[PDB]
Amino acid sequence: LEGAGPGRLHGRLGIKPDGQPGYTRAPSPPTDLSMPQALARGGGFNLYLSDHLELDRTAPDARHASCRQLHYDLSTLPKASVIIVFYNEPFSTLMRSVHSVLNGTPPQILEELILVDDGSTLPYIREDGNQQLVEYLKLLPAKVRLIRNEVRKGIVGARMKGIRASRAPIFAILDSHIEVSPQWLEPLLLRIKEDSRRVVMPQIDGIDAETFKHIAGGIGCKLGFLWKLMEHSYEGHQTARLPPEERQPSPTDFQTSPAMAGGLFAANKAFFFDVGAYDEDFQFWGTENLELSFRLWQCGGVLECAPCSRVYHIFRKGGSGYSSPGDSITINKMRTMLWMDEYADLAWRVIGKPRVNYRPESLEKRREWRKRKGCKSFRWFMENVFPEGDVVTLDDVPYLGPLRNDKIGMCLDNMGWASPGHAVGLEYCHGGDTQTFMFFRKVGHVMPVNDDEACLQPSGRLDWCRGTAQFWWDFTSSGQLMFRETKQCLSAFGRKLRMVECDDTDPYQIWSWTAYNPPDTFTFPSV
Template sequence: MIYHGIYRRKFINKIIILCMLSFLIGYGVVFWFTQSSNIQDSAIETGYFYSNKDSRSAKKNFSSKIEVLEALIAEDEKAIVPNLGENGRAVRIFGEELKQAEEIIKKEAFNLPLSNKIPYDRKIIDARHPRCLTKKYPSDLPSASIVIIFTNERWSPLIRTIYSVINRTPANILKEIILVDDASTLDELKDKLEYYISTRLPKFVKLYRLTERSGLIKARLHGARQATGDVLIFLDAHCEVGIKWAEPLLARIKEDRRNVVVPIIDVIDDKTFEYQNNGGTYDFEVGGFTWSGHFTWIAVSDEEKTRRKTAEAPTRSPTMAGGLFAIDRKYFWEIGSYDEDMEIWGGENLEMSFRVWQCGGVLETIPCSRVGHIFRTFHPYTFPGNKDTHGINTARTVKVWMDEYQRLFYNHRPDLKDIDIGDISKRIELRKSLNCKPFSWYLKNVYKNKFIPDEHAEAYGRVRNEVTNNCLDNLQQDEDEKINLGLYPCHEKLYDSQFFSFSLNSELRREFSCAEVLPHTHEVIMQKCNNSPWQKWQRTNSGALVFLMTGECLDSAGVKISGTLHVAACDKFKPTQKWTWDNYS
């Protein structure tokens, strides 16, 4: 009896010890898993909803709401006009309907009432180059995970984006469509969207919810972490993909996993929903940047046209717009994904563009892939904290990647020079670990025709008339358009509006625009540089600026503040024709 009692106590003690060990091990696993999740998504994931249910379970989950949800969906479908906007045709509205649409456009930044009438699965034009139509692609292309993030995206453009991907992407390469909702507040994007996905879309369409507004960068990172396809293809939530859009992208990545590729981005008109092919079938633009840190479209250089040989061949692009691109999933992480300390939106596209090129990759536009995109004139949603996230994110990019050329960025944005941009040590370490090249290499080998205002110039800085102490000034005009060359009191410091160069190519110019003369009025205007004789000047030892086509000199006589400069007969004794520069090379 004593023996059995001792045995029983020992047995009970072992059970207790085993239970405690199990608890500690279990707690450790949970703690490790939680910490791992926090390491990956600490900034965004306090919880998410993942929808990948069949219709039966959806009816069970929404059993008390089915009637209401079906009625809402039926109401949307009732508004659709069959064949409206078919083949990407423009749809024009008039009268009271137009007035109502114009008011909504002020809020939504596109014609929402018209979008709601156009079928989700409309056909669009085939804008590809004729030689693209006969191209053959490998049968063993890598699989694609399509990542689409959104916040308060309106229903019809979002659903149209999804259907265009489903209908125009072969099943054997479409691994999944990953939707990441960045904490939307619109009712139509809550139960209604979950129910619609569950009952009407294929199981490979998956919805993840972020419970806190996190921004484009962190939302995309979340989507990329869920992806299982060989290639990540990021799309905006207001697109329509073209015929055989995915195959050319995947084929190029299959050739070399370091190729980061973008489609030609065509325009879907924000008011008429007309599908407009970018540059026609034969001509298109690629990505550039401004020294102020913004993306811009530029023409394909003559050198690149020669290198690629044919118009439909992959075309090197110095930067990308960032909304639509494809990248090998493993390479995405190897090369540094996104800068996770960037906030919300802005600057991430230039950061990735510079990083890809400087760290051994190639960024290309693939002409045989075309995707339509609604370009909106403003953001119809808010940015938390009302911060200049674009500026701060770009300053992070500049500090890490642009080396000594950051001076040109800070000339445009002196307000950002001493601002707190957060810790960039991890990104600097990434650059070192990837053995990346300097920004000077990028300018010499990738963006060869990028104008460097203080290097490609005989003189640069403020251009001052000594008599009046007034300077050449762009008068804050939009330089995407033809503008007048103005006069304004010289600033104490050099600011962007008064930064001019006299180029080694005999141009009086700014970053993209050059001075020329209107023949009938003799007024001086700034227009896109085109290397024409009408943009050639001479700088004399006496300080005159001579327009070579007529032999006349830049003159400020009679020009009021904010007025337009002109040329007049040269007179070396006339003080209003004498100009000095801050710097001479």
């Protein structure tokens, strides 16, 4: 296209032959707008405002100053394919992503821009509808190509389709609702150029779902995972466990990460297929980011984060852009547990000892692949990749089970909500997950099994876990739950949890807690 230059690196996009934009911006959002209603209409973000905002939307440069002092020889860098998959993404957000990539990516290093319709049902996206998308693409460069999935396959199914169509040596995956900062692709290509085993991910920034403001700081560089099988950014007490030379790293140095946030990463195409690509039995939205990350490290790969590659992302708030089956997320977590070896016992209990159809036949074929590849163990992963975790070995979970007081013959009970912010009760013991708690010794945390983010407090309530003395309990040899700071013990006198002076002679402050002596091998549940 014509009109290229700074800020419009592929030329002026989306312009009819008459010099007029092919897209009419909506009027300003109505003054009387109930944000909860609008967040639930646009699928987790204010669509009224998005439809009013320009597609060539200027974004603040979120990169640190030292990142802008770096130079790249675009002739020596390999070209890449950008892959944006989407299911029923609105026109404004999807095309703003396209314009942002085209305007912000030098053409010398962008082989193509693949758009994958994961079986969308919206009229503007359908080939039996109003044909808005196809028509507007004619006003974009030919690098942009639209491929379509006959039926909604899911994230893994759509990404694999785009990767298998990409023709560049390197590919980069991006969500359909993003805005890039300057020189976002160049630092990633340089990393993969020097080692095809490196999978490099940008640092994710924020676009407020309600106001669409750009927020510096989304998902940092170093992130681990929760035993609910979920990516989780390093916390303070965890970054403190890092080697002293890695706690305040340089703004430009690349940092390894045990896990990725998902769907914003770049990789060498050939290595991606040799290291397992994706497990295509994953369904819809899910935890493919953790299955990839574990397998990546264990099978001879390196996951790192490029602090100088920043991309803005709309984190959905108060709504969801699509509806996925309820059993899909459970299945993806079961398949992910193949790579966790004995540690899968803890994850299985945290997600509720589920018993679904995790496609056992397919997973066996990947256990073989894992063996023929020589992949390393999850113990190795924890002791070498994520050694800063609160549970490096299952011996860090000494107790898992009911917390019973034999004097009153009752067990602690999360009362129907392992979520933080509610009081814990005392109820007759019944042997359900609502009355099973776990202990993490590295941090002194007493949590319900179904949420490792919920920590018991001397207030008798659960609150968000923090690696501080505000949540450090000691389980004495006498059976007392002692709070370290206050040096008081937890009592069940009067069927009301209270803190009292420690006294092993007081039966109301003596608790029993089942020891967690897991097996050495996790046997998957029968289907």
